[PDB]
Design a protein around this nucleic acid. Structure first.
Ligand SMILES: [Mg+2]
Lengths: 73, 32, 101, 550, 1280
RNA sequence: AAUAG
């Protein structure tokens, strides 16, 4: 059954903990991620902005696609 | 793509555009 | 800082250990100019000066181990180093390096 | 102690230092608005950046911005060093530094050659949408203020009352090409929120285009036959005919159809001198009906929209530049000025005020007789004054909108007024009906700080001047408006940040996902009239199920 | 007319006579500090109050005590000017007489064994200057008054917005000056709860039980009793007639309605009622009923009576039962239900529960609980309901005693409880929190007294601790008092308080407005983010007290206010405003100052009301206001009138002409921007004014005002000597007055403070006459800006939006040229390597840069310097520096090597060119004075000699003597010669003052007085500007599009009146140039001054010929006119003035295009506007950086123009770049421009090589983040 | 804190 969440709750419940920590409620996000042992694949814009890489949109999009090929191979 | 007039291109960050489009006008906001 | 409340002192503290990019570019230019000047010298004198000043080498060397190269002669190595400095001091091949003073 | 080191204040009383304030722990290092994530990672201070006050450059082109020479010298310093070294003017980089510090003429020539085709990014805070950052070609100017093109101000929400802009220099080739291709002002002329043009002319431009395209009865040179726009301009420059003279002009009009057919027709059209002189700058492929009318803000918006839809982008940019030049020139030539005699107060205002006061006294008498209750008295007094305000506004607008002129036959004819305030409001340059109401009619009923309406209204305008009580009542609402703006700014900022966070991952990743699902779209009906048409909802959407004819 | 006013009489367009002059504008500061420092024999205010509050200090054992006798303030070490030069606080020493009285242990307690009287130094008290400012660390500062919540009791409600239903919940809050807070609130179950210092709620009855109140006593206090008897075997109600007005009623003679008006039957009067038992069944007992035989309690208090209970009391023989009155409308069981939910039954249990709620997790003991409860509210040491708090408390609860009490008691708490219950019932109303009768003004004196008392308590603790020891044979009072805590408290308040603000000093108006500023923030006030809409609003009580226009535009809106023109603070700190009495129907010139509470009762007419010759009102119905609501009122019901038409607005708003034609949103901007104007080279009066300019100029203190009248003996650009009149001499006085003028002194905003004489030798002067004009003053009138010829027309888009087009002539005449004085410092310190030396021996610098330096290495006075020029030369010792091998080879080739010291010198900042006007050298005591410092010392000694000799000569000439003058000169020599107390490690300081002439340029901000602000876009040539038929070009072209949508029409009226005034001035100039007869000049002047039906009667017949010539000379540049706010010049007067000057009545002329010569198609509004040059100059705002300093931890560029920092690319800019799709630009911003240490160096090298490619890496901030997350014991890592 | 947008 699909659920409707508010924008704040939806933002806090994303897959990546870097974006969720960067939004708000850093302590809760980091504690949950640490106990769970989460892994962030850096798929969105905020993670790549934080780590200094090209964002997977626009001029960087193709670049990221190429990497997804090399990991596939 | 409303800013370009044609079909949207691959790699366009449409979520950021949507959020900015909604958020920018927030200051203007208050049987016959 | 001052009458503010969202300011902090640590936000205004420089990193005095950093090297200016102008200085780094000047160092690279000096390396290139020194290499070009050394290229206009006899290979023996160039190698002797390189060992005696540590250019393109991990360590500097005194006259003894520079003599250990081919002929172990402190008085000879000293003479050839003096000759190399005299030729490099000639205005014909020193205008490039003069600009770095 | 370990709890205080990790997270101070979570366990209990926060440990404080000698400054009597809580010590900052590692959790405080990483978290919050002032934490590492938001202060240093999602935003940073950058090099090759500057800031200055912005003035207006009315001579600029849409892709140009006026940049100060000293500011450019500081921003483009490594580039100047590189070109001094390349062309042999400086032996080393220290010599180049000395030359730049001494400000030699050859340094200025090198700076021109550096900035020849190097785009530069202009930013104004708050950056509410992506049009808050745009790329321009810099033109070096003497001075300390950035010159900004007028037609982009609406995109920046920028006015010249003390605004400051930041400037950034894209360094690598990829950044330069991104500035030229994506962020350049000539690429961004449509609003990404709605698709409507964002470089629509405003204020003086509109006013000028309004003044040149108006029509006057029995003007000098009426009834003259003109070979074309050039001869209309010649007649205007020779004082043969006025701008507002009704003439017949031979017009050659090219129409570009949907299929691309280009049909050229020459014919004699009844128009004014100003309309033909304005036709002189209209690109080929548009009807003359777009110009053969008085041009307010809406009409110029329609002109630009049709130019974009039927001709493209380059023609639209050139047309916008020419429109803004012409509007500025003829707004200057008009001599439009505001004066105390431009605020015409109708003679019916005093009679209406007297009638309202008398009938209010009658209603008070009825209240003293117990016929009506206090709430009824309040309500009907308020309705009385609202009706009086509407009547006074109507009489004032009617008096201000028209004038009587003598035509060629000698009779009296009704003409639309050339009153400066009326022209400013009607053209859409600045002003509305309510503001003219306040200038020349009644200020009307005002509200208390809680929101209730005061029975007696301000029966004076700003031309006559208010007394002390009326001004105090006005301040009641002025303060409320200012406070509301100040607080809603923060509320809107928080909402926008939340939306950007929730939607930041949405990127167009494919072309077609191969789904048959879709949404049902119908005209929006909220009563007996359409709120919005199906065309406006469907413009730009891909059909999911075949549209069979009914 | 005074002489200064006679020199240039301003035409008055007002019509209403003024019965009250505007009082001194800086009274709110001076009166407060006088209350603080002046000795009070009654001991109610200031230092005496604080001393009597803390002293006597009693030892715990009883051995001895320290008693306060008196205090005095010593003589300052330095004067104000000397304190500003040296950089020290202007203050006076506090010396307090104390007696240590030691008692005798063997003798009975209270026997004076010994007394030791001595004077103790109790700190240094900062002093207020003659103008209401303080000098703290050499900086002029203003302490801003606070608008806070008055102490007392306030009754409020949640307005039905907390619980699910409406259920409007009522609360009462007792707030003291010092101590804990008391809260009584209702829950949605109609139970009363108490909170002490905002912690967990407790049932209210507890607070009664701790006071010794039994449950029966509680019920008696909070309820009325309905009684019952057993009369002749029948039930007996005691009838209360008022209550009666569901059963059959007794009194068979006068039977009332049975199970189905009251007054008619109650008229006869009976005392007997018979009722059913079911009427008893529901009631609740009022007393505890005991049986001696049984020994038990048959029925308890607050217990519902039952049938079995009735039977039990029947057997017990009790015949009378009283129960509580309880209704649903007028009376309520709230206290009974509260008693039911109360688990406490005795004083000890209540004390224990209060202790548990106070101090959880501590074992409760009886003594600790008792001490806690006594200390909370009934101890004078920890509780203080101040005199104002007590008065407001008593007025709220209707108590007419305990006027001097400062602590709560049983009566106070019970009355607050009863009033809250009454408000719940319906009788009474809640309090208005924003009412100015509930908000108090707290000024400098009160805050200083509070902090001084804090310091006194700090030292009292230690004094008691020492006196408890006992060994006091050799102890003197000055061995017991440590003044450092008190000094720390006062310096904390005067230098680091939020309300101690760096003084606004752009112009006189800025200073006056800053001193009359009231903040809701500060210690004990509100917070910007936490403040709501209601506090920011304009309350109806602000009329005549707080200006509704002047308030900051921004997040501070509504929280900072300006005192109104006639507003005043009463003795309790509540604002009051003056009103004229209306006695017997006539408006008397007697003035009563009314506060907000007193104002509501009366009906107060406005100053615009029409008046007759007898002093009464003309109209039968006049527009007045009552209870904050305006309306039409009968003439006979009017009790008061407003004294002035500018009573509601502040000084800055009072300076705006035609304010009544401006929208309040723009009047706000005009008032705010009048305070940012920068003084120019030549001060020019406003042609159109309001009449308040003289008041601001005189009461600001910038001018030099004659203390006594007389004849100006000597005038000079720096000194004015006045020969005093024979009637005003103190017997045996020299008879002269000397005024030394401030010449080119830096202000707090780096502007110029300069005083220029406006008197001639031999000119008579009276008291109060202006002798010299300070900055922004012209002949005693405030001159903030310049009068500019203005055309309202568009000009080719150069006045687009709010842009301003300015003629080149305005630049040529230096009409907006300003002088800015900037202070620069070179500090030579002591380092580990060695001592930094100030010298002209600067390595790697040629003789070109040493030309302006002297032998000592300091620039000459009068040296014209540009950016990068050396002002003070300094060399810092440097350590051994490693040389790269290439540098070693370069040294071997060319052997030069001189790197003992490093050039760390003071240089003129870039893009700054000016003249050195002053150099000051401070040397530490014990360090050699160089040649330059000796030269300055000799010059100062010679100047002191010369000034003293000249002053002595003039005073002895007036009188017509060695020891006193020798003493004065010796003191001056000691002050000049002695060393300077500098910061530790500082060897020498050299301060250089630079004067910079800033001319108007594109980018500068210019404004009028109506919110019409803008930025200059172009400096137009004179031949290109619009001109009239006479060839006169306009000076400034303004956009007409900014007038209608902003509803500031006062600017058009000002333009018209300025045109008229300049026309009349031109006519006067023509009459002077043609040398017409003085009779014609007199006739013209009288015609000008008789225009309109004004309140001004200027008679030129009473002016001498020389006076008329001077007046005509001062009217050459235009006739100054006064248009008061809400009493201004009507349009008919403006048109008449235009007609007199032979100008069009519409104010519109025919202009021609200077570029083509062609007439513009419509007439253009041309006139004169007063325009200002705001302190927002593009010189101070243009910044650019390519590469510079970086942060220590984040390795990011610093922030600020002072640090040569970079702009911040914030989150929203990143969002914009993401929306565009510019990934590479964003990566440039994140990595190679901010914190990629290797990448940014590689990028610089690539650009120098012309390659334009980047090799991005990891930002350092992310590495820092990883390190901190790891430091939190969390393994965060990167996987490949 | 204050100020500008
Ligand atoms: Mg602006």
């Amino acid at each position: 059954e699909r659920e409707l969440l508010g924008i704040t709750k939806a933002s806090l419940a994303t897959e990546s903990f870097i974006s969720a920590a960067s939004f708000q409620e850093t302590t809760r996000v980091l504690t949950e991620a640490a106990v769970s042992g989460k892994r962030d694949d850096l798929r969105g814009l905020k993670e790549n902005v934080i780590v200094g890489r090209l964002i997977p949109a626009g001029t960087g999009f193709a670049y990221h696609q190429d990497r997804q090929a090399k990991r596939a191979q | 793509d409303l800013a370009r007039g044609h079909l949207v291109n691959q790699g366009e960050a449409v979520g950021v555009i949507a959020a900015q489009s909604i958020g920018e006008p927030g200051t203007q906001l208050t049987i016959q | 800082i001052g009458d503010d409340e969202d300011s902090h002192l640590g936000d205004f503290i420089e990193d005095t250990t950093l090297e200016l990019p102008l200085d780094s570019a000047t160092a690279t230019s000096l390396k290139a100019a020194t290499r070009d000047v050394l290229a206009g010298l006899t290979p023996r004198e160039a190698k002797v000066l390189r060992m005696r000043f540590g250019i393109d080498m991990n360590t500097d060397h005194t006259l003894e181990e520079v003599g250990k190269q081919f002929d172990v002669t402190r008085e000879r190595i000293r003479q050839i180093e003096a000759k190399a400095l005299r030729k490099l001091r000639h205005p014909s091949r020193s205008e490039v390096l003069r600009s770095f003073l | 102690s370990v709890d205080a080191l990790l997270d101070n204040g979570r366990r209990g009383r926060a440990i404080t230092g000698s400054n009597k304030r809580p010590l900052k722990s590692l959790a405080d290092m990483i978290k919050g608005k002032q934490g590492r994530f938001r202060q240093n990672l999602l935003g940073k201070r950058v090099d090759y950046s500057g800031r200055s006050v912005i003035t207006v450059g009315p001579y600029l082109r849409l892709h140009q911005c006026g940049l100060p020479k000293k500011m450019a010298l500081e921003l483009f310093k490594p580039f100047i060093y590189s070109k001094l070294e390349t062309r042999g003017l400086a032996t080393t980089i220290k010599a180049a530094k000395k030359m730049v510090e001494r400000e030699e003429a050859v340094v200025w020539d090198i700076l021109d050659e550096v900035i020849r085709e190097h785009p530069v990014l202009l930013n104004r805070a708050p950056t509410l949408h992506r049009l808050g950052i745009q790329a321009f070609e810099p033109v070096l100017i003497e001075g300390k203020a950035i010159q900004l093109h007028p037609l982009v101000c609406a995109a920046y929400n920028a006015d010249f009352d003390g605004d400051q802009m930041a400037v950034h220099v894209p360094l690598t080739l990829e950044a330069q090409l991104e500035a030229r291709t994506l962020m350049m002002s000539t690429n961004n002329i449509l609003s990404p929120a709605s698709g409507d043009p964002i470089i629509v002319p405003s204020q003086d431009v509109v006013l000028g285009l309004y003044y040149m395209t108006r029509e006057k009865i029995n003007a000098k040179g009426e009834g003259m036959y003109l070979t074309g726009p050039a001869e209309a301009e010649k007649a205007y420059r020779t004082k043969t005919a006025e701008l507002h003279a009704r003439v017949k002009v031979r017009i050659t009009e090219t129409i570009k159809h949907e299929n691309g057919k280009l049909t050229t027709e020459t014919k004699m059209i009844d128009t004014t001198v100003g309309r033909a002189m304005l036709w002189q700058i209209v690109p080929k492929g548009l009807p003359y009906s777009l110009v053969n009318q008085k041009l307010g803000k809406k009409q110029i918006s329609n002109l630009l929209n049709e130019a974009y839809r039927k001709l493209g982008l380059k023609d639209t940019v050139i047309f916008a530049d020419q429109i803004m030049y012409t509007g500025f020139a003829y707004a200057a030539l008009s001599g439009v000025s505001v004066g105390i005699d431009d605020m015409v107060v109708p003679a019916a205002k005093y009679t209406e005020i007297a009638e309202a006061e008398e009938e209010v006294r009658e209603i008070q008498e009825q209240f003293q007789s117990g016929l009506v209750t206090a709430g009824e008295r309040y309500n009907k007094v308020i309705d009385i004054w609202a009706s009086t305000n509407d009547r006074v506004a109507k009489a004032m607008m009617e008096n201000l909108s028209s004038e009587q002129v003598i035509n060629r036959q000698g009779e009296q004819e009704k003409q639309e007024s050339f009153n400066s305030i009326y022209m400013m409001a009607d053209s859409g340059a600045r002003g509305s009906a309510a503001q003219i109401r306040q200038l020349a009619g009644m200020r009307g009923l005002m509200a208390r700080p809680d929101g209730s309406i005061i029975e007696t209204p301000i029966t004076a305008n700003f031309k006559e001047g208010l007394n002390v009580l009326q001004y105090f009542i006005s301040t009641h609402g002025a303060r409320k408006g200012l406070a509301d703006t100040a607080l809603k700014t923060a509320n809107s900022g928080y909402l926008t940040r939340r939306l950007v966070d929730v939607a930041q991952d949405v990127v167009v990743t494919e072309h077609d996902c191969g789904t048959l699902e879709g949404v049902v779209m119908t005209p929006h009906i909220e009563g007996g009239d359409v709120k919005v048409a199906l065309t406006e909802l469907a413009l730009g959407r891909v059909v999911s199920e075949d549209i069979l004819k009914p | 007319y005074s002489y200064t006013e006679k020199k240039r009489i301003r035409k008055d367009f007002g019509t209403r006579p003024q019965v009250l002059d505007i009082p001194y504008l800086l009274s709110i500061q001076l009166d407060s500090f006088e209350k603080f420092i002046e000795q009070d024999p009654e001991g109610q205010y200031g230092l005496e109050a604080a001393f009597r509050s803390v002293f006597p200090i009693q030892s715990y054992n009883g051995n001895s005590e320290l008693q306060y006798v008196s205090y005095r303030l010593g003589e300052p070490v330095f004067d104000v000017k000397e304190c500003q030069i040296r950089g020290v606080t202007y203050s006076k020493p506090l010396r307090v007489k104390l007696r240590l009285v030691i008692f005798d242990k063997d003798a009975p307690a209270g026997t004076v064994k010994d007394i030791k009287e001595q004077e103790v130094y109790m700190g240094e008290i900062p002093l207020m200057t003659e103008n209401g400012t303080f000098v703290i660390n050499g900086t002029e500062r203003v302490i801003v008054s606070q608008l806070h919540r008055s102490p007392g009791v306030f009754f409020d409600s949640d307005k039905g917005k907390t619980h699910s239903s409406g259920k409007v919940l009522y609360n009462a809050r007792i707030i003291p000056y010092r101590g804990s807070w008391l809260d009584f609130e209702f829950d949605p179950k109609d139970n009363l709860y108490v909170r002490i210092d905002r912690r967990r709620k407790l049932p209210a009855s507890i607070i009664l039980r701790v006071l010794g109140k039994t449950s029966a006593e509680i019920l008696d206090i909070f309820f009325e009793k309905v009684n019952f008897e057993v009369k002749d075997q029948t039930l007996m109600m005691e009838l209360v007639p008022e209550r009666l007005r569901t059963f059959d009623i007794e009194a068979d003679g006068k039977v009332y309605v049975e199970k189905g008006h009251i007054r008619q039957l109650e008229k006869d009067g009976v005392n007997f009622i018979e009722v059913p038992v079911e009427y008893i069944v529901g009631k609740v007992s009022a007393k505890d009923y005991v049986n001696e035989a049984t020994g038990e309690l048959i029925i308890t208090a607050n217990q519902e009576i039952s049938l079995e209970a009735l039977a039990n009391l029947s057997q017990a023989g009790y015949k009378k039962l009283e129960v509580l009155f309880t209704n649903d409308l007028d009376h309520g069981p709230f206290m009974s239900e509260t008693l039911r939910v109360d688990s406490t039954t005795d004083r000890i249990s209540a004390l224990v529960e209060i202790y548990r709620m106070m101090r959880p997790g501590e074992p409760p003991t009886k003594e600790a609980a008792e001490s806690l409860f006594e200390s909370l509210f009934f101890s004078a040491e920890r509780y203080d309901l101040s005199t104002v708090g007590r008065m407001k408390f008593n007025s709220s609860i209707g108590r007419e005693d305990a006027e001097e009490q400062g602590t709560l008691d049983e009566v106070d708490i019970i009355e607050v409880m009863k009033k809250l219950i009454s408000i719940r019932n319906g009788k009474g109303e809640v309090d208005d929190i924003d009412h100015l009768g509930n908000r108090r003004i707290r000024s400098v004196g009160e805050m200083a007294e509070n902090q001084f008392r804090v310091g006194l308590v700090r030292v009292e603790r230690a004094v008691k601790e020492r006196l408890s020891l006992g060994d006091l044979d050799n102890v003197m009072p000055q061995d017991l008092i440590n003044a450092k805590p008190i000094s720390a408290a006062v310096k904390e308040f005067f230098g680091s308080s939020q309300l101690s603000q760096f003084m606004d000093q752009n112009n006189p108006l800025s200073e006056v407005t800053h001193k009359r500023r009231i903040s809701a923030l500060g210690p004990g006030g509100l917070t910007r983010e936490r403040a709501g809409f209601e506090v920011r609003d304009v309350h109806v009580t602000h009329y005549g007290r707080l200006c509704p226009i002047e308030t900051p535009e921004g997040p501070n809106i509504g929280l900072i206010n300006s005192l109104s023109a006639f507003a005043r603070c009463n003795e309790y700190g509540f604002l009051e405003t003056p009103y004229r009495r209306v006695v017997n129907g006539v408006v008397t010139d007697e003035v009563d100052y009314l506060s907000a509470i007193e104002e509501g009762q009366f009906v107060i007419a406005q100053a615009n009301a029409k008046l007759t010759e007898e002093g009464g009102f003309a109209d039968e119905l006049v527009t007045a206001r009552q209870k904050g609501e305006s309306g039409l009122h009968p003439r006979e019901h009017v009790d008061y009138m407003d004294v002035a038409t500018n009573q509601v607005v502040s000084i800055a708003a009072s300076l705006i002409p035609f304010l009544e034609h401006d929208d309040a949103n723009r009047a706000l901007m005009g008032a705010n921007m009048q305070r940012q104007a920068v003084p120019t080279l030549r001060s020019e009066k406003p042609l159109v004014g309001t009449g308040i300019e003289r008041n601001v100029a005189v009461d600001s203190g910038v001018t030099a005002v004659a203390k006594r009248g007389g004849v100006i003996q000597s005038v000079d650009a720096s000194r004015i000597v006045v020969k005093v009149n024979e009637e005003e001499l103190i017997p045996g006085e020299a008879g002269i007055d000397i005024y030394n003028l401030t010449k080119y002194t830096r202000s707090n905003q780096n502007t110029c403070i300069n005083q220029r004489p406006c008197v001639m030798p031999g000119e008579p002067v009276a008291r109060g006459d202006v002798l010299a004009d300070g900055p922004s003053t012209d002949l005693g009138e405030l001159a903030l800006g310049q009068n500019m010829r203005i055309a309202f027309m568009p000009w080719n888009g150069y006045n687009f939006e709010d842009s301003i087009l300015v003629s080149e002539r305005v630049v040529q005449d230096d009409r907006f040229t300003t002088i800015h004085i900037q202070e620069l410092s070179c500090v030579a310190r002591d380092t580990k390597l060695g001592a930094e030396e100030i010298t002209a021996d600067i390595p790697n610098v040629g003789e070109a840069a040493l030309s302006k330096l002297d032998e000592s290495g300091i620039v000459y006075i009068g040296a014209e310097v540009k950016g990068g020029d050396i002002l003070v030369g300094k060399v810092t010792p440097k350590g051994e520096t490693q040389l790269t091998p290439e540098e070693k080879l370069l040294r071997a080739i060319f052997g030069e090597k001189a790197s003992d010291v490093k050039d760390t010198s003071l240089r003129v900042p870039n893009s700054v060119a000016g003249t050195v006007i002053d150099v000051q050298v401070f040397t530490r005591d014990g360090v050699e004075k160089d040649k330059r410092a000796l030269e300055i010392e000799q010059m100062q000694l010679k100047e002191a000699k010369k000034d003293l000799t000249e002053e002595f000569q003039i005073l002895e000439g007036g009188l017509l003597l060695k020891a006193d003058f020798d003493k004065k000169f010796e003191a001056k020599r000691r002050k000049i010669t002695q060393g300077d107390d500098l910061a530790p490690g500082v060897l020498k300081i050299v301060k250089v003052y630079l004067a910079v002439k800033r001319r108007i340029q594109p980018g500068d901000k210019m404004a009028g007085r109506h919110g019409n602000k803008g930025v200059i876009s172009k400096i137009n040539p004179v031949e290109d500007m619009p001109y009239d038929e006479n060839g006169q070009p306009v000076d400034i072209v303004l956009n007409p599009l900014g007038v209608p949508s902003r509803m500031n029409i006062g600017q058009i009226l000002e333009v018209h009146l300025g045109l008229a005034a300049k026309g009349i001035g031109d006519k006067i100039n023509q009459m002077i140039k043609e040398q017409q007869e003085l009779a014609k000049l007199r006739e013209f002047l009288q015609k000008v001054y008789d225009l309109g039906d004004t309140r001004q009667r200027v008679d030129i017949s009473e002016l001498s010929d020389e006076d008329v010539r001077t007046l005509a000379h001062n009217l050459r540049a235009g006739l100054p006119v006064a248009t008061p706010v809400f009493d201004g010049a009507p349009e008919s007067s403006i048109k008449a003035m235009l007609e007199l000057a032979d100008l069009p009545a519409s104010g519109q002329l025919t202009l021609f295009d200077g570029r083509t010569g062609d007439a513009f198609e419509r007439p253009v509004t041309v006139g004169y506007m007063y325009m200002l040059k705001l302190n927002h100059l593009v010189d101070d705002k243009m910044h650019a950086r390519s590469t510079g300093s970086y942060s220590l931890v984040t390795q990011q560029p610093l922030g600020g123009k002072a640090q040569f920092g970079g702009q911040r690319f914030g989150e929203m800019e990143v969002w914009a770049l993401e929306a565009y799709g510019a990934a590479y630009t964003l990566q440039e911003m994140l990595t190679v421009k901010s914190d990629d240490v290797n990448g940014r160096t590689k990028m610089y090298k690539n650009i120098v090589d012309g390659n334009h490619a980047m090799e991005p890496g990891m930002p350092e901030s992310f590495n820092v983040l990883l390190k901190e997350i790891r430091s939190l014991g969390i393994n965060i890592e990167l996987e490949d």
